[PDB]
Design an enzyme around this catalytic site. Structure first.
Site, PDB file in Angstrom:
ATOM      1  N   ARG A 159      34.828  17.226 -18.660  1.00  0.00           N
ATOM      2  CA  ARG A 159      34.420  18.129 -17.595  1.00  0.00           C
ATOM      3  C   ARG A 159      35.546  19.093 -17.234  1.00  0.00           C
ATOM      4  NH1 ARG A 159      29.213  17.299 -18.586  1.00  0.00           N
ATOM      5  NH2 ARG A 159      28.557  15.171 -18.058  1.00  0.00           N
TER       6      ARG A 159
ATOM      7  N   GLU B 203      27.966  12.328 -11.811  1.00  0.00           N
ATOM      8  CA  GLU B 203      28.046  11.937 -13.213  1.00  0.00           C
ATOM      9  C   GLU B 203      26.827  11.173 -13.713  1.00  0.00           C
ATOM     10  OE1 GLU B 203      29.422  12.131 -16.005  1.00  0.00           O
ATOM     11  OE2 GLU B 203      31.050  13.541 -15.573  1.00  0.00           O
TER      12      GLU B 203
ATOM     13  N   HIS C  28      46.623   9.997 -26.886  1.00  0.00           N
ATOM     14  CA  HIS C  28      47.069  11.104 -27.721  1.00  0.00           C
ATOM     15  C   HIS C  28      48.098  12.007 -27.052  1.00  0.00           C
ATOM     16  CE1 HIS C  28      43.891   9.819 -30.324  1.00  0.00           C
ATOM     17  NE2 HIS C  28      42.928  10.229 -29.520  1.00  0.00           N
TER      18      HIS C  28
ATOM     19  N   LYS D 215      35.099   2.708 -30.300  1.00  0.00           N
ATOM     20  CA  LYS D 215      34.867   3.845 -29.418  1.00  0.00           C
ATOM     21  C   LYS D 215      33.382   4.043 -29.131  1.00  0.00           C
ATOM     22  CE  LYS D 215      36.590   7.675 -30.104  1.00  0.00           C
ATOM     23  NZ  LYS D 215      37.343   8.585 -29.197  1.00  0.00           N
TER      24      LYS D 215
ATOM     25  N   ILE E 229      34.391  17.273 -24.928  1.00  0.00           N
ATOM     26  CA  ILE E 229      33.330  17.629 -23.996  1.00  0.00           C
ATOM     27  C   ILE E 229      33.665  17.194 -22.570  1.00  0.00           C
ATOM     28  CG2 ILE E 229      31.555  17.633 -25.782  1.00  0.00           C
ATOM     29  CD1 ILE E 229      30.700  14.831 -24.447  1.00  0.00           C
TER      30      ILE E 229
END
Lengths: 501, 491
Positions: free
Chosen positions: A174, A284, A192, A393, A172
């Protein structure tokens, strides 16, 4: 009535209209700033969500904008209605029971998605490809004054995969329009990057990693995609559990990524991790644009766009409470926080992120009886709680955890701020963590040297009286509800006889 | 004409004229009902109740005026009852009320003038000696769990030395002990240094004369609750001598208690629901015993009461609001670039927010740690910062009188712990629940910090940022959306 708001984005909009929670704006509205100003006023006054059907510069199918899809309603008995509709629940379901429903669905038989042909997918009704793609001709909104560019992606999901399909991510992050054929966004976390880039470089595609970006997905899918579980799992099987049926997915035109079949708009293309472009800044979840504070981001080339007739682009306009970054992002951190407490045996009755704290606080409501059975103390309990949440997380966005007793309705900020200010000693009742991962979006982090370390700056604040760790501490709350029931019943019965309206 | 600052009954009349008073003829029990009604009026910001039919009240003793310093619902005059205490227009915002109290520290003190007893309404009736039964008065049991019925919550004590070089008006709480006695901690241990010995020199250290007044001029109840009168009034305060001692009390007082105090006959006092929203049931704390020898009162006397608890009541509008006024005066005295000071009610008067002029701050060539230590040294070692346990520094874009902006700047502009500068050697507020329910109640030291909610670069240069709410948009965009709000389809 075959309406399913959790399964179909347009059924979700229809229920909002049925419940008087949608204003279809046929007045011409400018995507530059106007849409953002309207959505903010709707957020802050908790008004019906706007559906912009006459945007300046929009073509016939591209596009309409659904504003405030996760905003709150004015009537408190159903303020979290739009959130409940994301899961197909009664709009009167309070946020506490929405969280409990998400946990009860984790215990359900996961239903994997099923592939449907392109003829059975509404997102395939139209196709743009190659030179006929001009993202600067779309009515993409300039949401906040100070934003570094028009942000198309604020309420959709990215789709990325390794070639072997062992790693699949629904993100998700931006997405900002770069030019006629390019967007940008931080979709692959640095953890990753090596895994996915080396895998595609093995097939000579390391400089062109295929991606898909979807808007107007099933609202249950955008909810789970906004839920903090390991990056590298769609958990679409869990989406099916919430849906009670298999999620219909369809193949992209230019790659083998699977996208929701009922998506409104689907972007397709490739990603070059070595081709960096300035991204942002963007207003934000904490309420700030810092003009001039962009940062390099990998460049995404858009090769194909498929979209429904009369496509609708949902947008989220983050800022001060309360918008989607608080009801959804914060609300789902609350659900995983409660789940994490159950897994580690922490006696937590409920967990919630107060919106007034811009999703930076995580309130934990402690069962005081069970806490006393643990034979622990504030320092030992605060460290353990922080070690569980700040090293997971789930607690990444949280910078202060509040521990309160079982008399505090944590979903009511009047009660939270009262227990906070009156039940914790400043500094001395705060257990600091200097070696945990910090949230870069936090303004006290980004505007400090800590933006270069991204470590520390978090604490667990004990707002439980020290003796309550050992025995009950008796006290009467000095408000109207704190009086005996027979007194309260007498005053309310005679309230009009006294002379009050 | 009406003068709400000078006369308690003109104050009530203005409330009635402005639709801010409900005269309750329904029977109301002083046991808990008065407290429950006042709390609902506090928390829903309703008109102030005037209890004219209390269980146990005689004709003249007494009626109760509830929520004298509560807030009104309409924000345009939410602090009207506080402004009326000073004689200001009801629409004067709290910011200007503070500034008015500051402008009044620059004017000449007007001494009081003595009036005869027939010219003082507080002398209209007299009870003395065996005629006094305080348990027969309709004294309220305000909170469930209170150690007793509290008659003194919005009145003033009057104490003096024989030489009358020392005189004090106090607002300490007063609880009914029995038919003839009340109790309270009216004198701080600092000033016992000169009151017991002075009266003992005459043989009266065993019975220090006191006066306790209710329904005083609202400006009197405001100055005595202020952490420092006729100057605020513009006139000389009319006073009258007590019946049994030489103490001067306001002439227009509704009720006047008189008697003697023994600092050795200690008696359990409390507990009492207080400014932080708690009462902790149990044994009280020993307090000196007050013998009541005489009571003078007006016809149809009215007793104003305060029922402290969660925000917002008198302990937040007045106590905190007057700390804010003195906090601002402190800043100007020490040259601290403070634009405004305020105690957010949602923090139960435990927070003191300071609004910093950032341009002047940058001229000081300082830094967060150095500035916070200086601020805490000034405020936590002063009488005004005694009740304040956390000072919050914010920039000049924050409306500190609007808690939505305060909690936003607080949560988003300070790093937990690292941006908090602790003070371990300052005096603690024993009433603070985190103090009283901790071993710090045995030390009363530390437990305070100055929290810097100003971005570190703002100490050196301007930090550009846009606030992401509707009001943060450019003016032309905001006007456009408001002009078209009905045309969009919204109500």
């Amino acid at each position: 009535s075959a309406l399913n708001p959790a399964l179909r984005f347009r059924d979700f909009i229809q229920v909002l209209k049925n419940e008087g929670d949608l204003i279809e704006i046929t007045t011409e509205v400018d995507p530059n700033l106007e849409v953002g100003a309207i959505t903010r006023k709707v957020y802050e006054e908790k008004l019906p969500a706007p559906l912009f059907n006459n945007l300046k510069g929009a073509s016939k199918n591209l596009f309409n904008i659904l504003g405030c899809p996760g905003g709150l309603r004015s009537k408190k008995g159903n303020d979290h209605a739009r959130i409940a509709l994301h899961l197909g629940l009664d709009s009167q379901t309070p946020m506490k029971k929405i969280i409990d429903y998400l946990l009860e669905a984790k215990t359900k038989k996961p239903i994997p998605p099923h592939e449907v042909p392109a003829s059975g997918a509404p997102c395939k009704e139209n196709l743009l490809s190659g030179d006929e793609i001009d993202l600067t001709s779309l009515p993409v909104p300039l949401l906040h004054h100070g934003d570094g560019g028009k942000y198309i992606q604020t309420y959709g999901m990215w789709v990325l995969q390794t070639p072997d399909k062992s790693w699949t991510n629904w993100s998700i992050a931006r997405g900002m329009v770069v030019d006629d054929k390019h967007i940008t966004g931080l979709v692959i976390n640095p953890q990753h990057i090596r895994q996915v880039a080396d895998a595609w470089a093995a097939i000579g595609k390391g400089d062109k990693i295929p991606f898909a970006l979807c808007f107007g997905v099933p609202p249950a899918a955008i909810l789970v995609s906004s839920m903090p579980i390991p990056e590298g799992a769609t958990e679409s099987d869990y989406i099916g559990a919430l849906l009670g049926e298999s999620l219909p997915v369809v193949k992209c035109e230019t790659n083998d990524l699977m996208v929701p079949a009922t998506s409104e708009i689907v972007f397709e293309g490739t990603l070059d991790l070595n081709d960096l472009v300035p991204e942002g800044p963007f207003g934000e979840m904490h309420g700030y644009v810092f003009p001039g504070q962009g940062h390099p981001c990998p460049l995404y080339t858009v090769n194909a766009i498929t979209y429904r007739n009369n496509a609708i682009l949902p947008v989220s306009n983050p800022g001060l409470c309360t918008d989607e970054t608080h009801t959804l992002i914060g609300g789902l951190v609350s659900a995983e926080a409660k789940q994490l407490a159950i897994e580690h045996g922490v006696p937590i009755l409920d967990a919630f992120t107060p919106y007034e704290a811009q999703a930076l606080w995580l309130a934990l409501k402690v069962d005081l009886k069970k806490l006393q059975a643990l034979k622990t103390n504030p320092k030992e309990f605060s460290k353990k709680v922080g070690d569980i949440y700040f090293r997971s997380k789930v607690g990444f966005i949280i910078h202060e955890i509040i521990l309160v007793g079982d008399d505090i309705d944590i979903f009511d900020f009047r009660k939270v701020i009262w227990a906070y200010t009156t039940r914790h000693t400043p500094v001395d009742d705060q257990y600091y963590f200097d070696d945990v991962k910090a949230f870069a979006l936090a303004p006290f982090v980004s505007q400090s040297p800590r933006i270069k370390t991204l470590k520390g700056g978090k604490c667990v604040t004990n707002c439980i009286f020290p003796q309550q760790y050992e025995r009950d501490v008796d006290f009467v709350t000095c408000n109207f509800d704190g009086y005996p029931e027979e007194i309260k019943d007498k005053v309310l019965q005679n309230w009009s006889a006294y002379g009050y309206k």
